[PDB]
């Protein structure tokens, strides 16, 4: 399969999540995503076919993971924006006040701004501290998906948000949205990953 940020993938033929970013660990291919999406060596599928397994994860506390893909997959420096793409050009972290979009299989491509950093998410499983908060909307299934600026700087992966009764926070104004992402840089360094760029 072609590995593009924001696309859908299943875990052990059960839950769905979204791809974060294409990365390599030496000769190994892979993609970063959210830690709550899978467990150590769980099987990931795209298009109903096996693509790789969860090589590592940290959830809760943090919310990160990377899926180790077989050589058959094609890594791409892309993030889905409708039928088109946003090129991944780097990983410069944007400051509070910056615009930033996100990509996922449920709400697609959504944009907003960064309202805060070092935010806490007291999830059902436990706390997840150190997250960054934007006001772009999101919903159930967007987890693991890419957060990237329109300039192409990869920011992190979708962790969680104040989901309303229908499942997302797109129905309420940005002023009420708490959409949270796990910063990309600590994921890259912890697992010795290199971001695939174009």
mmCIF file with all atom_site columns, C-alpha atoms in Angstrom:
data_model
loop_
_atom_site.group_PDB
_atom_site.id
_atom_site.type_symbol
_atom_site.label_atom_id
_atom_site.label_alt_id
_atom_site.label_comp_id
_atom_site.label_asym_id
_atom_site.label_entity_id
_atom_site.label_seq_id
_atom_site.pdbx_PDB_ins_code
_atom_site.Cartn_x
_atom_site.Cartn_y
_atom_site.Cartn_z
_atom_site.occupancy
_atom_site.B_iso_or_equiv
_atom_site.pdbx_formal_charge
_atom_site.auth_seq_id
_atom_site.auth_comp_id
_atom_site.auth_asym_id
_atom_site.auth_atom_id
_atom_site.pdbx_PDB_model_num
ATOM 1   C CA . UNK A 1 1   ? 0.000   0.000  0.000  1.00 0.00 ? 1   UNK A CA 1
ATOM 2   C CA . UNK A 1 2   ? 0.978   3.652  -0.368 1.00 0.00 ? 2   UNK A CA 1
ATOM 3   C CA . UNK A 1 3   ? 1.657   5.193  3.037  1.00 0.00 ? 3   UNK A CA 1
ATOM 4   C CA . UNK A 1 4   ? 0.144   8.667  3.266  1.00 0.00 ? 4   UNK A CA 1
ATOM 5   C CA . UNK A 1 5   ? -0.651  10.601 6.425  1.00 0.00 ? 5   UNK A CA 1
ATOM 6   C CA . UNK A 1 6   ? -4.299  10.677 7.413  1.00 0.00 ? 6   UNK A CA 1
ATOM 7   C CA . UNK A 1 7   ? -5.370  7.439  5.744  1.00 0.00 ? 7   UNK A CA 1
ATOM 8   C CA . UNK A 1 8   ? -7.283  4.669  7.496  1.00 0.00 ? 8   UNK A CA 1
ATOM 9   C CA . UNK A 1 9   ? -5.754  1.444  8.819  1.00 0.00 ? 9   UNK A CA 1
ATOM 10  C CA . UNK A 1 10  ? -7.203  -1.236 11.104 1.00 0.00 ? 10  UNK A CA 1
ATOM 11  C CA . UNK A 1 11  ? -5.618  -2.950 14.101 1.00 0.00 ? 11  UNK A CA 1
ATOM 12  C CA . UNK A 1 12  ? -6.072  -6.715 14.556 1.00 0.00 ? 12  UNK A CA 1
ATOM 13  C CA . UNK A 1 13  ? -9.139  -6.542 12.283 1.00 0.00 ? 13  UNK A CA 1
ATOM 14  C CA . UNK A 1 14  ? -10.871 -4.466 14.952 1.00 0.00 ? 14  UNK A CA 1
ATOM 15  C CA . UNK A 1 15  ? -10.351 -0.751 15.650 1.00 0.00 ? 15  UNK A CA 1
ATOM 16  C CA . UNK A 1 16  ? -9.587  1.913  13.067 1.00 0.00 ? 16  UNK A CA 1
ATOM 17  C CA . UNK A 1 17  ? -7.009  4.702  13.285 1.00 0.00 ? 17  UNK A CA 1
ATOM 18  C CA . UNK A 1 18  ? -5.243  7.108  10.932 1.00 0.00 ? 18  UNK A CA 1
ATOM 19  C CA . UNK A 1 19  ? -1.647  7.084  9.710  1.00 0.00 ? 19  UNK A CA 1
ATOM 20  C CA . UNK A 1 20  ? 0.581   9.781  11.171 1.00 0.00 ? 20  UNK A CA 1
ATOM 21  C CA . UNK A 1 21  ? 3.724   10.047 9.034  1.00 0.00 ? 21  UNK A CA 1
ATOM 22  C CA . UNK A 1 22  ? 5.933   7.841  6.870  1.00 0.00 ? 22  UNK A CA 1
ATOM 23  C CA . UNK A 1 23  ? 9.302   7.232  8.558  1.00 0.00 ? 23  UNK A CA 1
ATOM 24  C CA . UNK A 1 24  ? 12.323  4.923  8.351  1.00 0.00 ? 24  UNK A CA 1
ATOM 25  C CA . UNK A 1 25  ? 14.453  3.341  11.070 1.00 0.00 ? 25  UNK A CA 1
ATOM 26  C CA . UNK A 1 26  ? 17.574  2.454  9.142  1.00 0.00 ? 26  UNK A CA 1
ATOM 27  C CA . UNK A 1 27  ? 16.560  0.067  6.338  1.00 0.00 ? 27  UNK A CA 1
ATOM 28  C CA . UNK A 1 28  ? 13.199  -0.536 8.028  1.00 0.00 ? 28  UNK A CA 1
ATOM 29  C CA . UNK A 1 29  ? 10.074  1.260  6.779  1.00 0.00 ? 29  UNK A CA 1
ATOM 30  C CA . UNK A 1 30  ? 7.243   2.424  9.017  1.00 0.00 ? 30  UNK A CA 1
ATOM 31  C CA . UNK A 1 31  ? 4.746   5.055  10.111 1.00 0.00 ? 31  UNK A CA 1
ATOM 32  C CA . UNK A 1 32  ? 4.188   6.885  13.388 1.00 0.00 ? 32  UNK A CA 1
ATOM 33  C CA . UNK A 1 33  ? 0.726   6.933  14.948 1.00 0.00 ? 33  UNK A CA 1
ATOM 34  C CA . UNK A 1 34  ? -1.000  7.117  18.355 1.00 0.00 ? 34  UNK A CA 1
ATOM 35  C CA . UNK A 1 35  ? -0.072  4.675  21.112 1.00 0.00 ? 35  UNK A CA 1
ATOM 36  C CA . UNK A 1 36  ? -3.678  3.955  22.071 1.00 0.00 ? 36  UNK A CA 1
ATOM 37  C CA . UNK A 1 37  ? -4.235  2.607  18.544 1.00 0.00 ? 37  UNK A CA 1
ATOM 38  C CA . UNK A 1 38  ? -2.520  -0.741 19.098 1.00 0.00 ? 38  UNK A CA 1
ATOM 39  C CA . UNK A 1 39  ? -0.407  -3.041 21.263 1.00 0.00 ? 39  UNK A CA 1
ATOM 40  C CA . UNK A 1 40  ? 3.090   -4.537 20.981 1.00 0.00 ? 40  UNK A CA 1
ATOM 41  C CA . UNK A 1 41  ? 3.231   -6.269 17.583 1.00 0.00 ? 41  UNK A CA 1
ATOM 42  C CA . UNK A 1 42  ? -0.477  -6.047 16.740 1.00 0.00 ? 42  UNK A CA 1
ATOM 43  C CA . UNK A 1 43  ? -1.202  -6.425 13.010 1.00 0.00 ? 43  UNK A CA 1
ATOM 44  C CA . UNK A 1 44  ? -2.044  -3.333 10.938 1.00 0.00 ? 44  UNK A CA 1
ATOM 45  C CA . UNK A 1 45  ? -4.053  -3.520 7.701  1.00 0.00 ? 45  UNK A CA 1
ATOM 46  C CA . UNK A 1 46  ? -4.665  -1.125 4.803  1.00 0.00 ? 46  UNK A CA 1
ATOM 47  C CA . UNK A 1 47  ? -7.030  -2.087 1.980  1.00 0.00 ? 47  UNK A CA 1
ATOM 48  C CA . UNK A 1 48  ? -7.754  -5.286 3.882  1.00 0.00 ? 48  UNK A CA 1
ATOM 49  C CA . UNK A 1 49  ? -4.129  -6.399 3.488  1.00 0.00 ? 49  UNK A CA 1
ATOM 50  C CA . UNK A 1 50  ? -1.445  -6.832 6.160  1.00 0.00 ? 50  UNK A CA 1
ATOM 51  C CA . UNK A 1 51  ? 1.182   -4.072 5.988  1.00 0.00 ? 51  UNK A CA 1
ATOM 52  C CA . UNK A 1 52  ? 3.083   -4.350 9.274  1.00 0.00 ? 52  UNK A CA 1
ATOM 53  C CA . UNK A 1 53  ? 2.942   -4.607 13.068 1.00 0.00 ? 53  UNK A CA 1
ATOM 54  C CA . UNK A 1 54  ? 3.165   -2.229 16.039 1.00 0.00 ? 54  UNK A CA 1
ATOM 55  C CA . UNK A 1 55  ? 6.898   -2.154 16.738 1.00 0.00 ? 55  UNK A CA 1
ATOM 56  C CA . UNK A 1 56  ? 6.565   -0.057 19.905 1.00 0.00 ? 56  UNK A CA 1
ATOM 57  C CA . UNK A 1 57  ? 4.249   2.198  21.907 1.00 0.00 ? 57  UNK A CA 1
ATOM 58  C CA . UNK A 1 58  ? 3.816   4.330  25.021 1.00 0.00 ? 58  UNK A CA 1
ATOM 59  C CA . UNK A 1 59  ? 0.249   4.772  26.265 1.00 0.00 ? 59  UNK A CA 1
ATOM 60  C CA . UNK A 1 60  ? -0.848  6.166  28.620 1.00 0.00 ? 60  UNK A CA 1
ATOM 61  C CA . UNK A 1 61  ? 1.519   8.788  30.101 1.00 0.00 ? 61  UNK A CA 1
ATOM 62  C CA . UNK A 1 62  ? 2.431   9.664  26.521 1.00 0.00 ? 62  UNK A CA 1
ATOM 63  C CA . UNK A 1 63  ? 0.459   8.605  23.421 1.00 0.00 ? 63  UNK A CA 1
ATOM 64  C CA . UNK A 1 64  ? 2.803   7.384  20.694 1.00 0.00 ? 64  UNK A CA 1
ATOM 65  C CA . UNK A 1 65  ? 3.641   4.357  18.565 1.00 0.00 ? 65  UNK A CA 1
ATOM 66  C CA . UNK A 1 66  ? 5.251   3.314  15.323 1.00 0.00 ? 66  UNK A CA 1
ATOM 67  C CA . UNK A 1 67  ? 4.197   0.537  12.982 1.00 0.00 ? 67  UNK A CA 1
ATOM 68  C CA . UNK A 1 68  ? 7.042   -1.434 11.385 1.00 0.00 ? 68  UNK A CA 1
ATOM 69  C CA . UNK A 1 69  ? 6.097   -2.118 7.767  1.00 0.00 ? 69  UNK A CA 1
ATOM 70  C CA . UNK A 1 70  ? 7.371   -4.849 5.466  1.00 0.00 ? 70  UNK A CA 1
ATOM 71  C CA . UNK A 1 71  ? 9.407   -3.850 2.386  1.00 0.00 ? 71  UNK A CA 1
ATOM 72  C CA . UNK A 1 72  ? 6.311   -4.241 0.174  1.00 0.00 ? 72  UNK A CA 1
ATOM 73  C CA . UNK A 1 73  ? 4.828   -0.925 1.306  1.00 0.00 ? 73  UNK A CA 1
ATOM 74  C CA . UNK A 1 74  ? 5.617   2.413  -0.363 1.00 0.00 ? 74  UNK A CA 1
ATOM 75  C CA . UNK A 1 75  ? 6.543   5.296  1.944  1.00 0.00 ? 75  UNK A CA 1
ATOM 76  C CA . UNK A 1 76  ? 5.529   8.797  0.859  1.00 0.00 ? 76  UNK A CA 1
ATOM 77  C CA . UNK A 1 77  ? 6.241   12.358 2.095  1.00 0.00 ? 77  UNK A CA 1
ATOM 78  C CA . UNK A 1 78  ? 2.522   13.114 2.064  1.00 0.00 ? 78  UNK A CA 1
ATOM 79  C CA . UNK A 1 79  ? -0.500  13.969 4.179  1.00 0.00 ? 79  UNK A CA 1
ATOM 80  C CA . UNK A 1 80  ? -4.004  13.629 2.722  1.00 0.00 ? 80  UNK A CA 1
ATOM 81  C CA . UNK A 1 81  ? -5.995  16.800 1.984  1.00 0.00 ? 81  UNK A CA 1
ATOM 82  C CA . UNK A 1 82  ? -9.151  15.647 0.225  1.00 0.00 ? 82  UNK A CA 1
ATOM 83  C CA . UNK A 1 83  ? -8.089  13.926 -2.994 1.00 0.00 ? 83  UNK A CA 1
ATOM 84  C CA . UNK A 1 84  ? -4.846  15.960 -2.959 1.00 0.00 ? 84  UNK A CA 1
ATOM 85  C CA . UNK A 1 85  ? -1.793  16.096 -0.671 1.00 0.00 ? 85  UNK A CA 1
ATOM 86  C CA . UNK A 1 86  ? 0.340   18.251 1.606  1.00 0.00 ? 86  UNK A CA 1
ATOM 87  C CA . UNK A 1 87  ? 4.062   17.578 1.242  1.00 0.00 ? 87  UNK A CA 1
ATOM 88  C CA . UNK A 1 88  ? 5.958   16.728 4.423  1.00 0.00 ? 88  UNK A CA 1
ATOM 89  C CA . UNK A 1 89  ? 8.951   19.063 4.317  1.00 0.00 ? 89  UNK A CA 1
ATOM 90  C CA . UNK A 1 90  ? 10.281  18.840 7.862  1.00 0.00 ? 90  UNK A CA 1
ATOM 91  C CA . UNK A 1 91  ? 9.424   18.753 11.563 1.00 0.00 ? 91  UNK A CA 1
ATOM 92  C CA . UNK A 1 92  ? 9.929   22.330 12.778 1.00 0.00 ? 92  UNK A CA 1
ATOM 93  C CA . UNK A 1 93  ? 7.641   22.763 15.800 1.00 0.00 ? 93  UNK A CA 1
ATOM 94  C CA . UNK A 1 94  ? 5.200   25.660 15.428 1.00 0.00 ? 94  UNK A CA 1
ATOM 95  C CA . UNK A 1 95  ? 4.634   28.060 18.321 1.00 0.00 ? 95  UNK A CA 1
ATOM 96  C CA . UNK A 1 96  ? 1.375   28.844 20.107 1.00 0.00 ? 96  UNK A CA 1
ATOM 97  C CA . UNK A 1 97  ? -0.736  31.047 17.839 1.00 0.00 ? 97  UNK A CA 1
ATOM 98  C CA . UNK A 1 98  ? 0.332   29.302 14.640 1.00 0.00 ? 98  UNK A CA 1
ATOM 99  C CA . UNK A 1 99  ? -2.130  27.871 12.141 1.00 0.00 ? 99  UNK A CA 1
ATOM 100 C CA . UNK A 1 100 ? -2.107  24.086 11.825 1.00 0.00 ? 100 UNK A CA 1
ATOM 101 C CA . UNK A 1 101 ? -4.202  21.430 10.103 1.00 0.00 ? 101 UNK A CA 1
ATOM 102 C CA . UNK A 1 102 ? -4.787  17.747 10.790 1.00 0.00 ? 102 UNK A CA 1
ATOM 103 C CA . UNK A 1 103 ? -5.742  14.733 8.659  1.00 0.00 ? 103 UNK A CA 1
ATOM 104 C CA . UNK A 1 104 ? -7.748  11.636 9.559  1.00 0.00 ? 104 UNK A CA 1
ATOM 105 C CA . UNK A 1 105 ? -10.204 9.040  8.242  1.00 0.00 ? 105 UNK A CA 1
ATOM 106 C CA . UNK A 1 106 ? -13.251 10.386 10.080 1.00 0.00 ? 106 UNK A CA 1
ATOM 107 C CA . UNK A 1 107 ? -13.287 14.165 9.702  1.00 0.00 ? 107 UNK A CA 1
ATOM 108 C CA . UNK A 1 108 ? -10.722 14.349 6.912  1.00 0.00 ? 108 UNK A CA 1
ATOM 109 C CA . UNK A 1 109 ? -8.570  17.480 6.682  1.00 0.00 ? 109 UNK A CA 1
ATOM 110 C CA . UNK A 1 110 ? -9.344  20.191 9.267  1.00 0.00 ? 110 UNK A CA 1
ATOM 111 C CA . UNK A 1 111 ? -7.531  23.420 10.125 1.00 0.00 ? 111 UNK A CA 1
ATOM 112 C CA . UNK A 1 112 ? -7.221  25.711 13.122 1.00 0.00 ? 112 UNK A CA 1
ATOM 113 C CA . UNK A 1 113 ? -4.671  27.276 15.470 1.00 0.00 ? 113 UNK A CA 1
ATOM 114 C CA . UNK A 1 114 ? -2.463  26.185 18.378 1.00 0.00 ? 114 UNK A CA 1
ATOM 115 C CA . UNK A 1 115 ? -4.026  27.493 21.601 1.00 0.00 ? 115 UNK A CA 1
ATOM 116 C CA . UNK A 1 116 ? -1.741  25.826 24.155 1.00 0.00 ? 116 UNK A CA 1
ATOM 117 C CA . UNK A 1 117 ? 1.038   23.356 24.946 1.00 0.00 ? 117 UNK A CA 1
ATOM 118 C CA . UNK A 1 118 ? 1.835   20.969 27.819 1.00 0.00 ? 118 UNK A CA 1
ATOM 119 C CA . UNK A 1 119 ? -1.855  20.073 28.099 1.00 0.00 ? 119 UNK A CA 1
ATOM 120 C CA . UNK A 1 120 ? -3.113  17.088 30.110 1.00 0.00 ? 120 UNK A CA 1
ATOM 121 C CA . UNK A 1 121 ? -5.560  14.447 28.902 1.00 0.00 ? 121 UNK A CA 1
ATOM 122 C CA . UNK A 1 122 ? -7.022  12.332 31.690 1.00 0.00 ? 122 UNK A CA 1
ATOM 123 C CA . UNK A 1 123 ? -8.182  9.460  29.495 1.00 0.00 ? 123 UNK A CA 1
ATOM 124 C CA . UNK A 1 124 ? -10.110 6.397  30.642 1.00 0.00 ? 124 UNK A CA 1
ATOM 125 C CA . UNK A 1 125 ? -6.808  4.474  30.731 1.00 0.00 ? 125 UNK A CA 1
ATOM 126 C CA . UNK A 1 126 ? -4.864  7.103  32.646 1.00 0.00 ? 126 UNK A CA 1
ATOM 127 C CA . UNK A 1 127 ? -3.351  10.555 32.242 1.00 0.00 ? 127 UNK A CA 1
ATOM 128 C CA . UNK A 1 128 ? -1.446  11.631 29.140 1.00 0.00 ? 128 UNK A CA 1
ATOM 129 C CA . UNK A 1 129 ? 0.500   14.814 29.821 1.00 0.00 ? 129 UNK A CA 1
ATOM 130 C CA . UNK A 1 130 ? 2.608   17.006 27.543 1.00 0.00 ? 130 UNK A CA 1
ATOM 131 C CA . UNK A 1 131 ? 0.150   17.209 24.661 1.00 0.00 ? 131 UNK A CA 1
ATOM 132 C CA . UNK A 1 132 ? -0.324  20.224 22.397 1.00 0.00 ? 132 UNK A CA 1
ATOM 133 C CA . UNK A 1 133 ? -3.769  21.727 21.894 1.00 0.00 ? 133 UNK A CA 1
ATOM 134 C CA . UNK A 1 134 ? -5.155  23.092 18.656 1.00 0.00 ? 134 UNK A CA 1
ATOM 135 C CA . UNK A 1 135 ? -8.697  24.180 17.816 1.00 0.00 ? 135 UNK A CA 1
ATOM 136 C CA . UNK A 1 136 ? -9.058  22.362 14.494 1.00 0.00 ? 136 UNK A CA 1
ATOM 137 C CA . UNK A 1 137 ? -11.909 19.845 14.821 1.00 0.00 ? 137 UNK A CA 1
ATOM 138 C CA . UNK A 1 138 ? -11.667 16.034 14.952 1.00 0.00 ? 138 UNK A CA 1
ATOM 139 C CA . UNK A 1 139 ? -13.622 12.872 15.727 1.00 0.00 ? 139 UNK A CA 1
ATOM 140 C CA . UNK A 1 140 ? -13.609 9.136  16.505 1.00 0.00 ? 140 UNK A CA 1
ATOM 141 C CA . UNK A 1 141 ? -11.174 7.493  14.115 1.00 0.00 ? 141 UNK A CA 1
ATOM 142 C CA . UNK A 1 142 ? -8.901  10.481 13.500 1.00 0.00 ? 142 UNK A CA 1
ATOM 143 C CA . UNK A 1 143 ? -6.584  9.192  16.261 1.00 0.00 ? 143 UNK A CA 1
ATOM 144 C CA . UNK A 1 144 ? -3.008  8.714  15.084 1.00 0.00 ? 144 UNK A CA 1
ATOM 145 C CA . UNK A 1 145 ? -3.532  11.066 12.157 1.00 0.00 ? 145 UNK A CA 1
ATOM 146 C CA . UNK A 1 146 ? -1.169  13.795 11.014 1.00 0.00 ? 146 UNK A CA 1
ATOM 147 C CA . UNK A 1 147 ? -1.025  17.321 12.407 1.00 0.00 ? 147 UNK A CA 1
ATOM 148 C CA . UNK A 1 148 ? 0.901   19.477 9.934  1.00 0.00 ? 148 UNK A CA 1
ATOM 149 C CA . UNK A 1 149 ? 1.206   23.164 9.030  1.00 0.00 ? 149 UNK A CA 1
ATOM 150 C CA . UNK A 1 150 ? 0.219   24.385 5.549  1.00 0.00 ? 150 UNK A CA 1
ATOM 151 C CA . UNK A 1 151 ? 3.947   25.021 5.084  1.00 0.00 ? 151 UNK A CA 1
ATOM 152 C CA . UNK A 1 152 ? 4.548   21.284 5.450  1.00 0.00 ? 152 UNK A CA 1
ATOM 153 C CA . UNK A 1 153 ? 6.087   21.050 8.904  1.00 0.00 ? 153 UNK A CA 1
ATOM 154 C CA . UNK A 1 154 ? 4.966   17.853 10.668 1.00 0.00 ? 154 UNK A CA 1
ATOM 155 C CA . UNK A 1 155 ? 3.752   18.667 14.197 1.00 0.00 ? 155 UNK A CA 1
ATOM 156 C CA . UNK A 1 156 ? 2.531   15.447 15.757 1.00 0.00 ? 156 UNK A CA 1
ATOM 157 C CA . UNK A 1 157 ? -0.155  12.765 15.856 1.00 0.00 ? 157 UNK A CA 1
ATOM 158 C CA . UNK A 1 158 ? -3.821  12.945 16.895 1.00 0.00 ? 158 UNK A CA 1
ATOM 159 C CA . UNK A 1 159 ? -4.278  11.866 20.526 1.00 0.00 ? 159 UNK A CA 1
ATOM 160 C CA . UNK A 1 160 ? -7.779  12.921 21.583 1.00 0.00 ? 160 UNK A CA 1
ATOM 161 C CA . UNK A 1 161 ? -10.343 15.681 21.957 1.00 0.00 ? 161 UNK A CA 1
ATOM 162 C CA . UNK A 1 162 ? -13.538 16.927 23.587 1.00 0.00 ? 162 UNK A CA 1
ATOM 163 C CA . UNK A 1 163 ? -15.815 14.723 21.510 1.00 0.00 ? 163 UNK A CA 1
ATOM 164 C CA . UNK A 1 164 ? -19.417 15.879 21.528 1.00 0.00 ? 164 UNK A CA 1
ATOM 165 C CA . UNK A 1 165 ? -22.411 13.525 21.458 1.00 0.00 ? 165 UNK A CA 1
ATOM 166 C CA . UNK A 1 166 ? -22.206 12.875 17.724 1.00 0.00 ? 166 UNK A CA 1
ATOM 167 C CA . UNK A 1 167 ? -18.529 11.925 17.990 1.00 0.00 ? 167 UNK A CA 1
ATOM 168 C CA . UNK A 1 168 ? -16.528 14.979 16.958 1.00 0.00 ? 168 UNK A CA 1
ATOM 169 C CA . UNK A 1 169 ? -16.092 18.635 17.873 1.00 0.00 ? 169 UNK A CA 1
ATOM 170 C CA . UNK A 1 170 ? -16.761 20.005 14.385 1.00 0.00 ? 170 UNK A CA 1
ATOM 171 C CA . UNK A 1 171 ? -20.314 20.912 15.410 1.00 0.00 ? 171 UNK A CA 1
ATOM 172 C CA . UNK A 1 172 ? -19.175 23.447 18.009 1.00 0.00 ? 172 UNK A CA 1
ATOM 173 C CA . UNK A 1 173 ? -17.194 26.683 17.418 1.00 0.00 ? 173 UNK A CA 1
ATOM 174 C CA . UNK A 1 174 ? -13.387 26.565 17.505 1.00 0.00 ? 174 UNK A CA 1
ATOM 175 C CA . UNK A 1 175 ? -13.550 28.542 20.771 1.00 0.00 ? 175 UNK A CA 1
ATOM 176 C CA . UNK A 1 176 ? -14.877 25.422 22.550 1.00 0.00 ? 176 UNK A CA 1
ATOM 177 C CA . UNK A 1 177 ? -12.621 22.849 20.866 1.00 0.00 ? 177 UNK A CA 1
ATOM 178 C CA . UNK A 1 178 ? -9.869  21.042 22.728 1.00 0.00 ? 178 UNK A CA 1
ATOM 179 C CA . UNK A 1 179 ? -8.144  18.882 20.103 1.00 0.00 ? 179 UNK A CA 1
ATOM 180 C CA . UNK A 1 180 ? -4.926  17.305 21.373 1.00 0.00 ? 180 UNK A CA 1
ATOM 181 C CA . UNK A 1 181 ? -1.853  15.938 19.628 1.00 0.00 ? 181 UNK A CA 1
ATOM 182 C CA . UNK A 1 182 ? 1.285   14.127 20.738 1.00 0.00 ? 182 UNK A CA 1
ATOM 183 C CA . UNK A 1 183 ? 4.372   16.103 19.645 1.00 0.00 ? 183 UNK A CA 1
ATOM 184 C CA . UNK A 1 184 ? 6.280   14.422 16.820 1.00 0.00 ? 184 UNK A CA 1
ATOM 185 C CA . UNK A 1 185 ? 9.849   15.172 17.856 1.00 0.00 ? 185 UNK A CA 1
ATOM 186 C CA . UNK A 1 186 ? 9.941   13.030 21.018 1.00 0.00 ? 186 UNK A CA 1
ATOM 187 C CA . UNK A 1 187 ? 8.441   10.121 19.038 1.00 0.00 ? 187 UNK A CA 1
ATOM 188 C CA . UNK A 1 188 ? 11.168  10.418 16.398 1.00 0.00 ? 188 UNK A CA 1
ATOM 189 C CA . UNK A 1 189 ? 14.018  10.533 18.911 1.00 0.00 ? 189 UNK A CA 1
ATOM 190 C CA . UNK A 1 190 ? 12.705  7.831  21.218 1.00 0.00 ? 190 UNK A CA 1
ATOM 191 C CA . UNK A 1 191 ? 12.496  5.318  18.381 1.00 0.00 ? 191 UNK A CA 1
ATOM 192 C CA . UNK A 1 192 ? 15.392  6.602  16.265 1.00 0.00 ? 192 UNK A CA 1
ATOM 193 C CA . UNK A 1 193 ? 13.114  7.489  13.360 1.00 0.00 ? 193 UNK A CA 1
ATOM 194 C CA . UNK A 1 194 ? 13.705  9.666  10.311 1.00 0.00 ? 194 UNK A CA 1
ATOM 195 C CA . UNK A 1 195 ? 10.816  11.567 8.767  1.00 0.00 ? 195 UNK A CA 1
ATOM 196 C CA . UNK A 1 196 ? 10.347  10.873 5.036  1.00 0.00 ? 196 UNK A CA 1
ATOM 197 C CA . UNK A 1 197 ? 10.287  14.280 3.328  1.00 0.00 ? 197 UNK A CA 1
ATOM 198 C CA . UNK A 1 198 ? 9.884   15.815 -0.113 1.00 0.00 ? 198 UNK A CA 1
#
